[PDB]
Design a protein around this ligand. Structure first.
Ligand code: NA
Ligand code: NA
Ligand code: NA
Ligand code: NA
Lengths: 307, 307
């Protein structure tokens, strides 16, 4: 039966790498990966290099599109020193590795032969402040679509892809578990813009940020493996992030393996899992490329949208 | 504030026509339009000609996209005697004129300099048979998303855009108000495929037909004007379609202006209006181009998606 997708195993996919240069050291990859991630230069060579190739093949191809509409509208050319920004979305569950994935993707694309301006924005900074969340009785649905100012987010991405000289996004603090007063992330007409977050691929009654994506990525894995990673990582954070007295969750540092596991499973069950099942997973069908990870965080299978 | 769209009045839009040839006679336009429509060669010149231009500018541009993915996959070129079919969706309410719009669009694009294979398929043939509708208790929601076999529809469009030599779609009879046993509409690798129906722009938990559109059109107008047109047309059909004894709604032919109006308003209120408000309108934001009609069926304003 005909299909919009085309599956791959790491073997089939690593061949499409061709002669793409690996411009990332071991020290660099390290500072890009998160606690728990297993990503190594090998995976970066057999998976991220092909992806980066495909993306650049499409950055140019995509420009042909806006160019047509430009020609149709009888308008000028485009300052080649300012084309239409290529927007990439990276979606996935909490703890599946998407943040690392987006950080690595930005590193590789920015180090491309001509040195493109590659900006990365996480939807964290678009969550509503804790105070505003409490007001809406949402302090327990942090990460759900409604916990974000999707309007500000949409204005942000629209602003950037429309050619603005610069746009601003709030900044979120994982240490304080809240939006930081007065903080700003300024993005100035980048060549590429990667947007990473839980529900970026979301679709709805209004034009949304996913409708502005020229390419999308969905980091996938089994719901139980992600729970495992989540829990495991919660325990690990007792000696890293929670160890810090300034941490909103410093109280967690003193938890025992047992009580920490229980606490982690509860947050997963009451928050992260529901959101994954109800909002995130339903968006997967639309991803240009899905990176499937095995229980060991290893990306061994990919699903690409040819249609 | 930045915007994904760009508005136009007929004046601004007719200028983008450039020197596009008008290859349609008065006799031809007539056999393409529906009862109640006011479309004339002027509107076809100041509105449909520009649109046809823009579309052909993008058919080629769109091919650059699939070509990139083809080059990336290290696969052959594409029999230029068989590129990737360009899929166009035309959405809108019952009685807004979309069917005429799609019929005219196919006539103009098919008569393009190189003579493209331009096929047109209405979602009618994908409604579930009356018997199946009754089974699902849906005989009163005919036209709502659930009243269609969206799977068969998706398989159909996927089949065609994936390069199949031919695909088949059931046929619907407006005379009998039902799907015709054994009837088939065969579509063989067209250059362009126009899909017209109520909820074609719909989006959801799964990859849908709207995700395969390279271009979309949404014929729009005020909910009350469409009700007016609907009713008015119901009355008019007493002497055309309902006059036929073989008609499922032959009983309507004997209705008086008064009782016919009442009947028409009731169907609109209980069926067509709700569907428009709940399913159709929410899809409008996503249309590449929205054709706004005034109470006189006249297209005088357009909204194009530049992003
Ligand atoms: Na996190
Ligand atoms: Na994040
Ligand atoms: Na109709
Ligand atoms: Na129809």
């Amino acid at each position: 039966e005909p299909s919009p997708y085309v599956e791959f195993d790491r073997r089939q996919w690593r061949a499409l790498r061709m002669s793409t240069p690996l411009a990332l050291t071991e020290e660099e990859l390290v500072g890009l990966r998160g606690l728990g991630e297993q990503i190594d230069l090998l995976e970066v060579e057999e998976v991220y290099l092909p992806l980066a190739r495909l993306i650049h093949l499409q950055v140019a191809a995509r420009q042909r599109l806006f160019a047509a509409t430009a020609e149709f509208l009888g308008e000028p050319q485009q300052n080649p020193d300012r084309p239409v920004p290529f927007i990439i979305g990276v979606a996935g569950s909490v703890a599946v590795g998407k943040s690392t994935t987006a950080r690595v993707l930005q590193a590789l694309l920015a180090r491309w032969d001509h040195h493109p301006r590659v900006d990365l924005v996480t939807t964290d900074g678009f969550l509503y402040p804790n105070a505003e969340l409490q007001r809406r009785n949402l302090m327990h649905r942090k990460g759900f679509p409604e916990s974000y100012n999707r309007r500000a987010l949409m204005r942000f991405v629209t602003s950037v892809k429309s050619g603005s000289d610069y746009a601003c996004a709030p900044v979120y603090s994982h240490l304080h578990y809240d939006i930081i007063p007065g903080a700003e992330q300024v993005v100035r007409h980048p060549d590429i813009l990667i947007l990473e977050g839980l529900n970026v691929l979301q679709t709805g009654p209004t034009l949304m940020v996913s409708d502005l994506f020229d390419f999308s990525l969905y980091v996938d894995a089994r719901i139980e493996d992600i729970e495992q990673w989540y829990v495991s990582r919660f325990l690990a954070m007792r000696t890293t992030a929670f160890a810090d007295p300034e941490s909103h969750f410093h109280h967690y540092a003193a938890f025992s393996d047992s009580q920490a596991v229980v606490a982690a499973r509860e947050i997963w069950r009451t928050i992260n899992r529901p959101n994954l099942v109800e909002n995130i997973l339903p968006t997967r069908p639309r991803a240009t490329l899905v990176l499937r990870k095995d229980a060991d965080h290893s990306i061994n299978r990919l699903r690409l949208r040819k249609l």
